[PDB]
Amino acid sequence: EVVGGGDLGPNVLVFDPSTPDIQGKVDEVFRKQESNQFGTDRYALMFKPGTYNDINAQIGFYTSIAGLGLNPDDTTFNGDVTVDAGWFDGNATQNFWRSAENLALNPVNGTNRWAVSQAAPFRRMHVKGGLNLAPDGYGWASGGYIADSKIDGEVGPYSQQQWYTRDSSVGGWGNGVWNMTFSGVEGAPAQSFPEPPYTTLETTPVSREKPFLYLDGDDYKVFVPAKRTNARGTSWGNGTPEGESLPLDQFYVVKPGATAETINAAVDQGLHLLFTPGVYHVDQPIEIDRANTVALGLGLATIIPDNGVTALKVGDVDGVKVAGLLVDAGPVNSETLVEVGSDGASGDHAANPTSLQDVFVRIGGAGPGKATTSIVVNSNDTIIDHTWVWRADHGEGVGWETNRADYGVHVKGDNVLATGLFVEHFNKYDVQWSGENGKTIFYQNAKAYDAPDQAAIQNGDIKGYAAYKVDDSVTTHEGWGMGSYCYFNVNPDIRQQHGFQAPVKPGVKFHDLLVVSLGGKGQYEHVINDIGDPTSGDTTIPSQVVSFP
Numbered sequence: 001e002v003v004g005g006g007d008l009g010p011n012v013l014v015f016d017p018s019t020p021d022i023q024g025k026v027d028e029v030f031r032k033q034e035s036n037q038f039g040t041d042r043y044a045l046m047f048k049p050g051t052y053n054d055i056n057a058q059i060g061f062y063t064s065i066a067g068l069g070l071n072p073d074d075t076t077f078n079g080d081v082t083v084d085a086g087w088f089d090g091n092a093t094q095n096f097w098r099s100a101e102n103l104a105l106n107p108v109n110g111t112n113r114w115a116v117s118q119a120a121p122f123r124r125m126h127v128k129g130g131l132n133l134a135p136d137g138y139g140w141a142s143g144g145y146i147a148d149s150k151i152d153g154e155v156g157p158y159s160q161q162q163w164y165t166r167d168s169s170v171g172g173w174g175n176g177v178w179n180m181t182f183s184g185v186e187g188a189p190a191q192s193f194p195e196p197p198y199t200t201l202e203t204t205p206v207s208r209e210k211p212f213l214y215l216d217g218d219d220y221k222v223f224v225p226a227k228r229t230n231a232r233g234t235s236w237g238n239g240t241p242e243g244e245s246l247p248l249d250q251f252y253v254v255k256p257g258a259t260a261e262t263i264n265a266a267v268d269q270g271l272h273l274l275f276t277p278g279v280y281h282v283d284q285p286i287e288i289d290r291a292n293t294v295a296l297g298l299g300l301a302t303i304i305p306d307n308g309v310t311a312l313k314v315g316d317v318d319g320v321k322v323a324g325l326l327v328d329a330g331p332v333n334s335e336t337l338v339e340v341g342s343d344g345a346s347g348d349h350a351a352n353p354t355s356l357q358d359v360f361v362r363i364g365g366a367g368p369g370k371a372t373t374s375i376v377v378n379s380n381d382t383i384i385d386h387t388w389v390w391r392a393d394h395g396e397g398v399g400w401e402t403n404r405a406d407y408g409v410h411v412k413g414d415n416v417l418a419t420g421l422f423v424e425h426f427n428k429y430d431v432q433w434s435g436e437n438g439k440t441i442f443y444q445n446a447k448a449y450d451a452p453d454q455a456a457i458q459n460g461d462i463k464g465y466a467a468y469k470v471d472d473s474v475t476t477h478e479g480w481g482m483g484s485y486c487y488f489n490v491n492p493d494i495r496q497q498h499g500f501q502a503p504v505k506p507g508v509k510f511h512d513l514l515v516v517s518l519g520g521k522g523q524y525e526h527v528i529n530d531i532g533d534p535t536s537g538d539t540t541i542p543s544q545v546v547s548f549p
């Protein structure tokens with residue numbers, strides 16, 4: 001039998017305000033992680049409730065930072081949680097895989113800088129000042145995700161291409177570049193697409209905040225927020241948040257050495273899962289087939305499936321909460337990397353859905369990796385709240401065949417909701433949606449850069465594969481604030497027929513679509529189906545469609 005609870009290990013650094021040389025300790029981690037884009041090192045920085053002076057916590061690759069109070073203002077920095085782009089000469093477009101949660105910031109010059117691109121969530125934060133999302137110098141940046149946060153002053157994206165904010169409060173919002181989408185944000189700018197490109201929804205249809213580690217006195221627990229319907233503003237602004245607390249001893253604390261056999265045994269025996277920061281090779285799928293299981297990763301905990309197996313399979317049960325995990329493909333092709341529900345699953349989970357939150361997938365980049373379909377969502381009512389599903393475009397083990405990955409996300413279940421959907425560079429369809437009444441709020445895609453020629457992406461009678469395809473048989477679907485970009489740098493004579501493909505039906509609707517050619521490297525012929533202007537020139541001007549059909 002598996003023993004629950006226990007020590008969190010050497011990769012969880014726990015601070016309190018009396019800890020000697022905090023600034024030195026977080027600086028040493030940053031120096032190691034700053035340019036460590038593909039290394040296997042992992043860190044979670046955890047701060048006990050209290051007030052911390054004279055701190056500038058710079059956050060590098062694979063570093064999470066968080067407070068351990070029940071509320072964000074319980075753990076306050078007089079100081080900053082900083083991401084900048086110094087290591088990449090002011091270019092922030094590779095600032096991936098890091099996170100900040102459950103802290104209050106009093107930034108030293110009045111504005112906190114969080115200049116990130118994909119897979120860098122900012123959750124349950126209170127910024128007592130402004131929030132600058134751009135690197136110093138206003139260089140390139142491609143984020144981003146803010147949820148359940150309160151920014152007292154102005155959020156300034158400046159150069160940020162696009163952004164998603166949900167269930168939050170902002171004192172102001174400075175500008176929009178290609179696609180700034182908001183749902184349930186108090187203080188959001190009014191709907192105005194295309195100028196500025198603001199897509200604004202009064203509420204989020206359903207959301208359930210990500211579970212997180214905290215301290216109840218001296219005891220570690222995991223808070224599990226209750227879901228909200230038609231959510232707006234923060235969950236924590238008005239007193240004790242709704243939800244339940246799980247004692248650490250009800251978790252199997254996963255550390256280096258654990259096997260999928262032991263992990264699966266823990267779940268069968270009734271334990272939840274806490275993945276401590278590290279890299280976990282498994283030789284069989286991790287299986288979660290118990291209702292309400294929490295599977296929570298710290299410090300960008302990473303699962304690698306060996307032998308071509310699937311990394312994670314969730315059964316046909318209510319309430320599973322998967323959060324804060326990177327799934328990294330192995331060199332042997334996996335048919336699937338993540339499965340939510342069985343094939344053909346038709347039960348409903350409306351009152352208590354399964355969710356994936358801050359679940360990131362990588363294929364290649366840290367060595368060759370391959371997978372046919374990365375995430376398959378079978379279970380009805382599933383919530384996908386911030387995912388980055390990424391076929392690597394740079395790094396080691398990358399190439400049109402070397403890290404081939406045909407399909408990113410396939411949604412087969414009904415009433416599935418995706419909020420903050422980022423999917424890039426797959427050889428065929430990045431996202432396919434076959435289930436009914438699906439909803440996507442915010443989509444960011446970039447197409448494969450390394451397609452060798454036109455013939456390599458021929459899709460029957462269509463040039464290229466849509467970034468986002470709704471199956472012809474679908475009756476109801478709706479999407480808001482969605483963009484697909486191309487950069488066919490291997491062969492810039494390539495044409496991509498469209499970013500989006502869907503049947504023309506009254507129940508299948510899109511709002512605020514765009515496609516963009518990055519510097520004239522390839523062009524789009526249309527935005528969706530054969531509708532919308534082609535892109536033209538080398539000046540990276542979006543082609544837009546406000547309403548479809």
Ligand SMILES: OC[C@H]1O[C@@H](O[C@@H]2[C@@H](O)[C@H](O[C@@H]3[C@@H](O)[C@H](O[C@@H]4[C@@H](O)[C@H](O[C@@H]5[C@@H](O)[C@H](O[C@@H]6[C@@H](O)[C@H](O)O[C@H](CO)[C@H]6O)O[C@H](CO)[C@H]5O)O[C@H](CO)[C@H]4O)O[C@H](CO)[C@H]3O)O[C@H](CO)[C@H]2O)[C@H](O)[C@@H](O)[C@@H]1O
Nearest residue numbers: 093138139140141142158159177393424446487518519540
């Ligand atoms: O790297 C691997 C990674 O790649 C990703 O794809 C890359 C993709 O991100 C990249 O796209 C480029 C794109 O970012 C860029 O967008 C620009 C945008 O930067 C620009 O911002 C302006 C700001 O410059 C300006 O700053 C103002 C400042 O000048 C002034 O001095 O002060 C002002 C404040 O006082 C300040 O505001 O501010 C304005 C708003 O006021 C911003 O609009 O805006 C332009 C549009 O105007 C926008 O185009 O454009 C480039 C082309 O020019 C894009 O190339 O492209 C790469 C390929 O070249 C991609 O690789 C993928 O997503 C990842 O998966 C990969 O791993």
Ligand SMILES: OC[C@H]1O[C@@H](O[C@@H]2[C@@H](O)[C@H](O[C@@H]3[C@@H](O)[C@H](O[C@@H]4[C@@H](O)[C@H](O[C@@H]5[C@@H](O)[C@H](O)O[C@H](CO)[C@H]5O)O[C@H](CO)[C@H]4O)O[C@H](CO)[C@H]3O)O[C@H](CO)[C@H]2O)[C@H](O)[C@@H](O)[C@@H]1O
Nearest residue numbers: 056080082084085086087089090108109111112113136137
């Ligand atoms: O003390 C509290 C503040 O802490 C800051 O953290 C510091 C962090 O930002 C800093 O990173 C350095 C990078 O900014 C630097 O990147 C270069 C840019 O500075 C530069 O910009 C210039 C611009 O300053 C000038 O006004 O205009 C120029 C023309 O437009 C423009 O070029 O662009 C460069 C590319 O051309 C770019 O490389 O790179 C440095 C070297 O790596 C980084 O050190 O690092 C500090 C030391 O560690 C951090 O303390 C927060 O960012 C603030 O929010 C806090 O207030």
